[PDB]
Amino acid sequence: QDLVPAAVEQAVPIQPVAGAALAAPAAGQINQIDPWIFQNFVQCPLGEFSISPRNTPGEILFDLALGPGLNPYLAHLSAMYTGWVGNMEVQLVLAGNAFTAGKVVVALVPPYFPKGSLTTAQITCFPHVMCDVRTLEPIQLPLLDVRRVLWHATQDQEESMRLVCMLYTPLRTNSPGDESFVVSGRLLSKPAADFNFVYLTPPIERT
Amino acid sequence: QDLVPAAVEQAVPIQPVAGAALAAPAAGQINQIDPWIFQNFVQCPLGEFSISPRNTPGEILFDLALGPGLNPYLAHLSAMYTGWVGNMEVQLVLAGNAFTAGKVVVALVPPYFPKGSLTTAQITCFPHVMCDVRTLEPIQLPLLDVRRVLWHATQDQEESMRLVCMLYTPLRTNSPGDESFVVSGRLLSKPAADFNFVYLTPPIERT
Amino acid sequence: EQAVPIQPVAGAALAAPAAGQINQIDPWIFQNFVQCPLGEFSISPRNTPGEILFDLALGPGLNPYLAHLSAMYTGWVGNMEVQLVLAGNAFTAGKVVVALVPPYFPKGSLTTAQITCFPHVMCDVRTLEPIQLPLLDVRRVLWHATQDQEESMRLVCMLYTPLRTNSPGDESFVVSGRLLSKPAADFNFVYLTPPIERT
Amino acid sequence: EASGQDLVPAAVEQAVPIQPVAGAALAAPAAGQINQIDPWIFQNFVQCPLGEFSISPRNTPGEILFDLALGPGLNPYLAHLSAMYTGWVGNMEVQLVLAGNAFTAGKVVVALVPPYFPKGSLTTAQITCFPHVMCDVRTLEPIQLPLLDVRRVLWHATQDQEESMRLVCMLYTPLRTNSPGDESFVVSGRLLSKPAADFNFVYLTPPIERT
């Protein structure tokens, strides 16, 4: 006998990817960061968007890319280093009342996947999480570092794992004053447990 | 003395059915699949429907059937094999605001049950789960493999356990702009812990 | 050469608990390869590769003695053992592939490439000894019923690589092949039954 | 024309001067998932998609009989699986079937040209400069030979624009026959393949339709 539940958490599963352990011998240095940067999220420099009843399902709300540019602290430290390697952790927040119905999908698109058009039927094929616009609490995901190079360079804009958000179900409400109720959405990020820069360097302050 | 609670999870109970353990001696092979296919749901190729205030209670919203056709990964691997056996796991998501009231029932209709008309009084007789249209999180169910044959054939459209969704309680709202508020609904699926194909075969790509 | 990527298929040890009886066969029948009813072909130098030389499914109809015994029982189950013979001297060249298609497969054309994807063997036309290989009873039911031909595992023989020989003014020197079969160690009939007249 | 041993059953694998090459073991700690292909695929050889070719007595020494690059496009199974993932690692094992008639004669050469080598000419003067084998068109047994993943990065994207150690078989000596009558046996050569010990893909993706 057994008993299967009918409601479980989302909890995207992963297989741990190595950070500095791969880039160690081929890098001149391995530079730590302030251990408190791992300790809270912070709004990504571009983590801003807004859903609207005039968005068709399938539209990509945002498409971020793993890197130190997702965290204003890492973005500031990146001026003193030539490259980076490791994982990060993102979270999303929405602003919707009980009148807005609709669901979006946040998926972890890997690198080297053909950058083209994604259908709603495809977006769920990736490791993902489904979030409806009525949620109050933030929703987090691990941005791993699937890569075939030992460590990326900061200033060269390497290709890494992306994170895409698609409007799964058409956002629609009842008929109060609507079509003027953009659901705002924000993104915050913080380095995962295995993030660190690669080579100390004069702060060039121009990146 | 004792104390019985008043609110528990749904958690449909099961008795484990054997997968490859039955089909082992009478099959030429037993082919594994990528162990990561077990690790996330993905929208069923036909997992799309929509409830409307113009649906009478009793209407069947969808009726799926156990098989590799519920998962685009299994559906793709099925071209290299002649048959399959095992269990799967489905989940359902809805898109409703706080104004839509109504409940549906998801039941596991067994094979060889007379394919006819099901009343609302009957739908709850099966192992089922009750879901109201206001739910935010997905709701999952185990699609077991009740069968009297050792293993089904992929290309012959065998008869297996179905999964039916009936509008239990009439979906109705208050009176904002309504009758134009179809509650979208989607289905995702993934192989259970005991799924595998039966016989390697040139990929015929035409199924 | 009897090494194909296949598992041992249980027969008559899987159908025993649900069969009323398990009837045996005259053991002499186990010791004589008999010509299958359509297990014969003849390759010509102009036969294009990819052709189907023979195709035949497992069942009691592959053996005259087994076909005669089938009229006396209700069901049958078990494997068989076949061998291919080719008539070619040392001055030939060309290959023939023999595959084991599963007992559920969309019928139609098979290119010379797909035929290799099954558990198969490749055979040169210069092989003296008969090529032996098993015919296992892959199935979903326990034991097949004698009075209705259901899907069973089939042998398919495809001309893989064309024939390269000289030939005199006549008659182009075909390479003829034949196929013989016999019951395996655990081929049995199920339920003794009065032999109905039109079987 | 007969079953005799007047042929060259040179199934001998001359020691190809090349070290072993690590496969998926290098990309495992860099892939976010755990992936694995059907073990039965590792069992039997199968004709490569473009696995057929033919040698005519009018072919000139130096003509490329075939030139095929390492990747999932060498097995129907692997090619079908490659539509589900994004990236692949590992080596391959290839059998060459050259069992021409006993009245024929001629030799070809198979070489493991490394990546980043300029494609194109590959003249007969330099085909032997690579780790190679010399094969006779009258060989009975299939000639086994490895296809290692000599690479610069961890894995190759399943979109195989990458550079992989391609394998090239070139006609070395002209094909000539010896039978007394008005006919030169054109020999039909085949190519079978199967994944090596630790060939593997990396990251699951939606199985695109038009691969």
Curated annotation (Swiss-Prot), chain C:
<protein>
    <recommendedName>
        <fullName>Capsid protein VP1</fullName>
    </recommendedName>
</protein>
<comment type="function">
    <text>Capsid protein self assembles to form an icosahedral capsid with a T=3 symmetry, about 38 nm in diameter, and consisting of 180 capsid proteins. A smaller form of capsid with a diameter of 23 nm might be capsid proteins assembled as icosahedron with T=1 symmetry. The capsid encapsulates the genomic RNA and is decorated with VP2 proteins. Mediates virion attachment to the host cell receptor CD300LF.</text>
</comment>
<comment type="subunit">
    <text>Homodimer. Homomultimer. Interacts with the minor capsid protein VP2. Interacts (via P2 subdomain) with host receptor CD300LF (via N-terminus); this interaction requires Mg(2+) and Ca(2+), and allows viral binding and entry into the host cell. Stochioimetry is 2:2. Bile acids interact with the P domain dimer interface and act as cofactors enhancing virus binding and infectivity. Interacts with host receptor CD300LD; this interaction allows viral binding and entry into the host cell.</text>
</comment>
<comment type="similarity">
    <text>Belongs to the caliciviridae capsid protein family.</text>
</comment>
<feature type="region of interest" description="Shell domain">
    <location>
        <begin position="1"/>
        <end position="198"/>
    </location>
</feature>
